Amino acid sequence: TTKFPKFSQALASDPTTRRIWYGIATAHDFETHDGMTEENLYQKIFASHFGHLALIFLWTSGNLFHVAWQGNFEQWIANPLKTKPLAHAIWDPHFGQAALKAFTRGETVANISYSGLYHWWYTIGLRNNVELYSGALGLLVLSAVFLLAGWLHIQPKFKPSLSWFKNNESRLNHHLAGLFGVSSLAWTGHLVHVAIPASRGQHVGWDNFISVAPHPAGLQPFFTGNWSVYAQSPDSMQHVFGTNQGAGTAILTFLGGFHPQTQSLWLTDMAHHHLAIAVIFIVAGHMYRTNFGIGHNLKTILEAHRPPSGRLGKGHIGIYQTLTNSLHFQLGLALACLSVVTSLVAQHMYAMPPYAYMAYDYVTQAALYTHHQYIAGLLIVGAFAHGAIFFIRDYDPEQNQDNVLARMLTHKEAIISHLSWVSLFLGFHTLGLYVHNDVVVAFGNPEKQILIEPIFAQWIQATSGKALYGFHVLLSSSTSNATTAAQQLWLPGWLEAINNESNSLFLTIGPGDFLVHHAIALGLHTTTLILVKGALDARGSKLMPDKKDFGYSFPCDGPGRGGTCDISAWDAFYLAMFWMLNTIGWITFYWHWKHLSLWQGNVAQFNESSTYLMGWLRDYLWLNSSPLINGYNPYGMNSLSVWAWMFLFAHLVWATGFMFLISWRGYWQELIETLAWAHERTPLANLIKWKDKPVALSIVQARLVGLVHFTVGYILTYAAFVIASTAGKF
Amino acid sequence: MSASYLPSILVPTVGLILPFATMAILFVAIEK
């Protein structure tokens, strides 16, 4: 604790540049820090959590403040379909005059926003820059508060005990009823009091919200139980959003489908959704036994779920202790569920646009889908990484004897071998069918293509009421008890939306959609295979039966026993990242091309070209690259210059990653030795001495540095393309 | 914007002065 890093004496004693790198890379692995106790670990994490939350509120503050100060929110409200929202001003003294003009948006040099903040803020009732700014100040206070809380809870009297941190039943009650439930109840309050009034051109703010009742009938219906009153007189189908013209009085409805003007969910549906959700969460958070002698014990629930056959051995006996005592098990489950939520957000927000006019902001739609699927992809890789770490660091076989978790390890070869089978099957046949299609199309015979109708997915569209395919099942059947039950509620609005081919609600699907879905299945299964193999072999294999003794991350076990490069569970994380990027690539390529085709009104292009891979390269990548790569050229530059420059930058970063991934350490260490030699023997230069002996990056470090360049290049390349291709085209 | 001078002060600060100060501070911190 007398040289960086203070938390590792083993690193601090390292006389080489490795000390600095490993200091940075291990700074947050609190468990492995010198003299770390379980109590200090939890308390450090809790305080770090306050830091991270404060960061989220400062970032959000920044976005509100920049739009308030430098944006065109007020001008965008006036004309949301034509006006481009501004992110923030550019001040760059490297700009030539031509670049200042190219990026001039009105009277300001500025970036256009593709984050959808204007659409969201406008939908939730924000109407002017002073309201945004008030938001910014409000969130600076929230940041400051969390920084105070963070600071308080690492002061001796305010450090919570380990028993506090392992109070599962209490945290679940509060998080369900309070964090989810009451937040959703309070948010309902915002929609009913502020957002819905704002949608009907009625200003409700801090100035008047005490006096201005969000419904004419007040709270008399709510206490008399005459709740139908709140659903009467919804906004007409002629309602001009932000105005009273065709406005209703309803605050809670079940209209289904879209506001025809804003092509977004009804605010009164979203109000009533959140009321329903709030109640479900408040009830759900009264499940678990705290201090009042009612509710469930989570251990008692788990221990009871042992099938009497003995087919799951001891069932869930021991799982309670295993989960409660492992932060990595907890982080794994949390990342797994959050990943799924992030993917569901991506899928549901494009299909059922919540925000006024954002269906028309094509760049924002594409940006948001892509952003969230890459976050979801990172989260699920992380979930499995912490699954693997859990197995090495926290899993005790003796405490999990013959339970569901121990039984996974018992048949790991059955699991891995079957994931291998499904991956091989999907890979052979998906690549096979695409290559069949490419060859017969290349030979001028597209009628010889294997074009398998996605009839199961088409049948599901028909169950939700899509008439197009000729199936008359459930909601697409007039006589179904499913149809008749919903006819007076959401079904008219929903059927209108689902049978409209202009929106993204249950897009029409054909053979193109069949093939890419099997590509997506291949990617999910293979990424899963790598991560699961990583987790189930983390503790040991036939090649390294004592792997758990070497920990999550180590270079290898040397060239003996045939050679052991990339044997650590960390190496499975490293390999899975490539497959995650590849898979999210296929997903987001598919989303983007399907939407470009829809938005152009040339669905036929996607339908015909998507069934062979040259179609993707030519009609998606090559065709849509033109606006991007002409951001600058010999004749001049335009506002896409920054995406053109970023695009090349990202290709460079991607390719630089290959150096670290392909060329390994020994080459570099030998080269550095000659440079050290040269420096010491060069006059004048040799008066200057390094304090840290320069060495080549470590074996694992280069995998990480290579993967970061690869990942950054991968993401920035696609970001520049998906933005510039969409912005350039519309 | 209203305070259109501010980017002329803060972008150099965040972009040149503060990164040099931070690099200088971290250099001394990791070399002592």
């Binding site: 830091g51 404060a54 600076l140 | 209203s2 305070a3 501010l6």
Partner: peptide, 28 residues
């Protein structure tokens, strides 16, 4: 429109967050 005063009020509150952030950072 956001006034010079409003931008400077934001900066003093951001300064306060800076102070409280350094206080937390120094302790963690």
């Amino acid at each position: 429109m956001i006034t010079d005063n409003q931008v400077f009020v934001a900066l003093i509150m951001a300064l306060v967050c800076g102070y409280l952030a350094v206080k937390l950072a120094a302790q963690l």
